[PDB]
Amino acid sequence: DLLAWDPLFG
Amino acid sequence: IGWRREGIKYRRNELFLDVLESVNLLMSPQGQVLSAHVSGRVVMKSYLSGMPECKFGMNDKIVAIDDCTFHQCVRLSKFDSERSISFIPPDGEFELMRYRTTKDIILPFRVIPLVREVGRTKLEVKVVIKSNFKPSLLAQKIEVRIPTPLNTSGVQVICMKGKAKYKASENAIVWKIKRMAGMKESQISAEIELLPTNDKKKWARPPISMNFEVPFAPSGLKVRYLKVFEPKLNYSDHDVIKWVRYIGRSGIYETRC
């Protein structure tokens, strides 16, 4: 499930 | 450099970092840690144009960890040389690092057993589980395996969450919970009818074992950054779409009863 992927911002 | 060919081109510069950990525990009946370890890896899946130089930073020294090994592409970082590593990665999927920790492990579940002998023909077995992590997070695929004596005839069992069944062929009660939030508890109670046996020795109780999946690294490791520099194509960080996932799983996660 794609909800487990978090963004890495920077 | 042998592991990445020249001329790679993608419409969409994107990468995925998978932090995958197995947490192992042997706990005493009274809640003393006899042994614990995490075995962990970081898998990188990248579709990056050209020959990008990458810098991977974590929240802790990787260069509270042991038996830490790196892909052949990995080099010392210039800056943050203790918490990061630098590399031109292989294209697609590869294992960046593999590691072991023993220190400061989050044990996502506490198992509290109670066995009571009611006469000679009856055993009462009760287990409480407690989720030890943030209440905003969910554990899933929870299974508690409770051993039963070989002279078990009948079992009655109920639980306050999920479903349980006695599996006579496995000498175990199996308790399944689809999902459980952090800082919660549940209980199972079984009554076990015992038959007469020539066994003179008292039941040598196997430990209670758990399976679970949790959306965090039980080591406490966190990815802080993945920086990218492609000198020739001149794209940088804001050009690259970057994702991280943490999956913590039980390995051998045992509590003596």
Author numbering:
A (entry chain DDD): 107 to 116
B (entry chain AAA): 159 to 221, 242 to 435
Sentences from the paper on this structure:
Proper operation of the pivotal CME cargo adaptor AP2 requires membrane-localized Fer/Cip4 homology domain-only proteins (FCHO). The AP2 complex, composed of α, β2, μ2, and σ2 subunits, is pivotal to mammalian CCV formation, and its deletion is embryonically lethal in mice. FCHO1 and FCHO2 are similar in overall domain arrangement —folded N-terminal acidic phospholipid-binding homodimerization F-BAR domains and C-terminal folded μ-homology domains (μHD) separated by a ~300-residue, low-complexity intrinsically disordered protein linker, which has been suggested to participate in AP2 activation, although how it does so is undetermined. We dissect the network of interactions between the FCHO interdomain linker and AP2, which concentrates, orients, tethers, and partially destabilizes closed AP2 at the plasma membrane.
